[PDB]
């Protein structure tokens, strides 16, 4: 007698699946009136045979298959790897042959890469530098730069902002204030997000700021000459006099150099008691690995008293 065979068709296209790395994924393929025909799963890009009916041809022990009423055919991949992402094909041995496809995506939380990511930068003021931060993850992570302690960042237009996106933080014409700790942030919607601490150290030659370039004092009393230096790396601060003779530590002279954060020094020279020999022009000097600078202070005498005649 025998009977007529019906034309097997796909009930619906393969539904896309996104799966977390290291977990399991399930590619399903629904057919109608399969009857005597057979369903097959294949990896498209590799063109590798995976399953036929209820048999796993591939030796990949992470691959499995199972069907429901010969309608829903589901392939299971254990311990998902990023390699496993790609297109898969559901094929029926009809005549002609029918096939569907569906994409499996693997999501990975972001991870910052040591080699391609900047370590601890040391650049001279005036040159340019780019802080770099590279991460891996699925999808492609976004890179956000932030300055530690809420300090803003300035774009090329002069606008100040709190964050900058992009793997490269281009700083044309670095400056003193750009020195500090920077935060790189990589996020892709797959927790957890990650961040890396990148320090930027800026070298510059010392810069002296004389509190008062003119100072009058009376004989026999005391006077204090004041300067403030700003230099990184740290500088040595000393006082000279006239042609450059270093000031003698003994006798009337006394000094006090104290650091006050921000890589600034407060250098003070106290002369006491003033006599004619101690009046004249002085110099406060500071030097580091890049050079030295000075500021001149003129100390003149003013009489105790004045009479209008």
């Amino acid at each position: 007698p025998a009977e007529v065979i019906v034309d097997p068709k796909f009930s619906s296209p393969i539904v896309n699946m996104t799966a977390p790395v290291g977990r399991d994924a399930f590619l399903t393929c629904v057919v109608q009136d399969l009857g005597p025909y057979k369903v097959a799963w294949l990896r498209v890009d590799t063109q590798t045979i995976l399953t036929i009916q209820n048999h796993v041809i591939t030796k990949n022990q992470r691959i499995g298959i199972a069907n429901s009423e010969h309608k829903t055919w589901t392939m299971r991949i254990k311990d998902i790897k990023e390699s496993d992402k790609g297109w898969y094909m559901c094929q029926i041995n009809t005549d002609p042959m029918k096939s569907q496809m569906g994409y499996l995506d693997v999501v990975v939380p972001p991870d910052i890469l040591d080699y391609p990511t900047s370590t601890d930068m040391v650049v001279r003021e005036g040159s340019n530098v780019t802080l770099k931060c590279a991460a891996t993850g699925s999808p492609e992570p976004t890179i956000t730069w932030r300055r530690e302690s809420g300090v803003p960042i300035e774009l090329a237009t002069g606008e100040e902002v709190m964050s900058i996106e992009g793997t490269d933080l281009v700083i044309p014409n670095v400056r003193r204030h750009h020195m500090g700790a920077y935060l790189c942030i990589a996020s892709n919607g797959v927790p957890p997000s990650v961040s890396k601490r990148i320090t930027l150290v800026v070298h510059f030659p010392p810069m002296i700021t004389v509190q008062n370039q003119l100072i009058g004092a009376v004989e026999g009393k005391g006077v204090t000459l004041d300067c403030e230096s700003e230099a990184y790396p740290k500088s040595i601060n000393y006082w000279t006099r006239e042609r450059g003779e270093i000031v003698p530590p003994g006798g009337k002279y006394s000094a006090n150099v104290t650091e006050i954060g921000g890589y600034r020094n407060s250098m003070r020279l106290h002369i006491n008691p003033l006599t004619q020999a101690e009046f004249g022009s002085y110099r406060c000097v500071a030097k580091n690995s890049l050079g030295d600078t000075d500021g001149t202070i003129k100390l003149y005498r003013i009489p105790h008293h004045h009479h209008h005649h």
Partner: protein, 201 residues
């Protein structure tokens, strides 16, 4: 522990329309793995082991028990079937071997009119050409209607067959009414071609 191919299977295979094509794939130390044939063009499976999956009856897997050879047999090849067929092993990752089948149409022809009329007493000269085949034919049949012709079956028959020129000249002297019929030239590596003969008197 690890399977590998034979290296001597002749990747390039050329078949002619009709007859049948064979792609031989040999694997050393197979083990529990399975050998499969696929069509790279549309990623259609053909054979797995000895079983056929394609449901195109022309494809069949040939494997003698215990042998190293897994032969993909294509019955009634056609020009569309020209493409790349891959021999595949179930390992992970899979090891493949890309065969390239190229089928060509090879037709034979007999110089002269398709239908000849010669007066009784005159001679018959049927020159057959099989220039399309890639390899020169190893034999050329001459069918008198349906039965094979033999130079000894009748006096005055001269048959010169040259595989060097892919030709075969059949000469029948002093035709007779009995000599009428469609004479067929069927070379080995090529298609058929016939010529019907009629006599007078």
């Amino acid at each position: 522990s690890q399977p590998y191919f034979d290296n001597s299977s002749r990747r390039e295979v050329t078949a002619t329309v009709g007859q049948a094509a064979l792609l031989h794939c040999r694997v050393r130390n197979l083990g529990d793995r399975a050998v499969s044939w696929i069509r790279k063009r549309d990623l259609h499976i053909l054979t797995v082991g000895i079983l056929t999956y394609t449901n195109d009856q022309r494809f069949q897997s040939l494997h003698s028990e215990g042998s190293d050879e897994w032969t993909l047999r294509i019955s009634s090849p056609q020009p569309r079937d020209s493409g790349t067929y891959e021999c595949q092993v179930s390992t992970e990752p899979k090891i493949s071997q890309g065969f390239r089948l190229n089928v060509v149409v090879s037709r034979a022809k007999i110089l002269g009119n398709a239908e000849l009329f010669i007066k009784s007493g005159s001679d018959i000269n049927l020159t057959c050409l099989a220039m399309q085949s890639p390899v020169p034919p190893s034999f050329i049949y001459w069918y008198k209607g349906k039965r094979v012709m033999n130079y000894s079956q009748r006096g005055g028959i001269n048959v010169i067959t040259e595989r060097s020129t892919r030709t075969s000249k059949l000469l029948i002297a002093k035709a007779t009414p009995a000599d009428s019929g469609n004479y067929t030239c069927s070379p080995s590596s090529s298609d058929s071609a016939s010529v019907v003969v009629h006599v007078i008197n």
